[PDB]
Write a protein that binds this ligand. Structure first.
Ligand SMILES: N[C@@H](CCC(=O)N[C@@H](CS)C(=O)NCC(=O)O)C(=O)O
Ligand SMILES: N[C@@H](CCC(=O)N[C@@H](CS)C(=O)NCC(=O)O)C(=O)O
Lengths: 207, 207
């Protein structure tokens, strides 16, 4: 399966950790966004939205990281541990995945990207949205070891890609004790952690 | 099942159309967000993220509209038509759901909300993001009647809730012929269209 990516990119890293958790070796293809490789006809034919990550599995093309993570589990997982079939367990995971995209990582992009990609001054009011997102995550973790229940799921892996990017951005995770505990645990149990962290250090260069 | 909502709210309306497509009558509960009803201790116990829509099924609380829609189909659907089990079919649906949240409806909120809720001048650069989102949707619709394939799915119902909100905002959907065709068809086939449209007319009052 082809996997169009950049190593620093959080949504790309969430997929790579899922692949490791499934014992799948993706064919990693760097896509040079700075050079506009994603905007040429050959890439637009695969993904007309011209985003990474993009997976190509035979003649099936797919994008949106969290869709790709779930696809890998549903198609290739030997059991449903990373994405349980039980509708209520799955639903908590899905809510956490939309949280990760539209609350947590959105707060990251909105506050950091203008500084690191557009040379704009930081906006303290956008920092407060990060604090709010971490507070929610801290609450979601009350009473459980993992983000959506009692075992490692794709919710954890998505959120871990995001929170590891906050670490290298110098965000003080320690102010959210449940998050800090969950994060330290995941560095020891999440498959593909080392590759995710190496990618975080590459992203860190932007700072 | 309890459903905390406002009729005007697009993410609420996507869930209502899914319930109607499943033959489920939700116990609809208006929430007074302007008065901070969602910020009270009682609501925070149900949904600490204090958002609508929120579903309560017995003792199980769930939020994120697109997670709720999929939960209703997975738990209560007599077949999987609205959310097929085939991993590739489901993955396209899921990518469209994330599109709806992070690209299409994001463009709506970013451009219109500052005008209708904050009395800020429109930002023409933010309008261009709506046009880009509609261009992508127009492309996604090439060669199929529905958003993620050849049958009505939750992807259609989420996108329909969003696009019908753009209609009452006076966005010119006719500039996107595949979107226009798909939209017109869904007004005739989507269960719960009349309730969705009544709710769009409520939202229109903010303009
Ligand atoms: N919500 C998407 C985000 C993907 C995304 O925005 N990727 C950026 C990474 S720099 C990108 O490819 N941007 C290029 C573009 O949108 O043209 C996901 O989770 O996969
Ligand atoms: N991505 C969420 C969006 C939910 C949302 O933002 N709802 C607004 C509707 S006005 C809300 O409840 N805001 C109140 C708050 O966040 O305190 C979904 O699809 O359900």
């Amino acid at each position: 399966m082809d996997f169009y990516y950049l190593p620093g990119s959080a949504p790309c890293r969430s997929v790579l950790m899922t692949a490791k958790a499934l014992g799948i070796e993706l064919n990693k293809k760097l896509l040079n966004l700075q050079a506009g490789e994603h905007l040429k006809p050959e890439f637009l034919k695969i993904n007309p939205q011209h985003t990474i990550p993009t997976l190509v599995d035979g003649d099936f093309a797919l994008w949106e990281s969290r869709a790709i993570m779930v696809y890998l589990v549903e198609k290739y997982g030997k059991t449903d541990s990373l994405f349980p079939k039980c509708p209520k367990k799955r639903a908590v995971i899905n809510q956490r995945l939309y949280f990760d995209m539209g609350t947590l990582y959105k707060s990251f992009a909105d506050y950091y990207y203008p500084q690191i990609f557009a040379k704009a001054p930081a906006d303290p009011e956008l920092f407060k949205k990060i604090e709010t997102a971490f507070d929610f995550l801290n609450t979601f973790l009350k009473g459980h070891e993992y983000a959506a229940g009692d075992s490692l799921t794709v919710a954890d892996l998505a959120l871990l890609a995001s929170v590891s990017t906050f670490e290298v951005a110098s965000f003080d995770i320690s102010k959210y004790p449940n998050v800090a505990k969950w994060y330290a645990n995941l560095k020891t149990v999440a498959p593909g952690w080392e590759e995710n962290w190496a990618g975080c250090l590459e992203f860190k260069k932007y700072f």
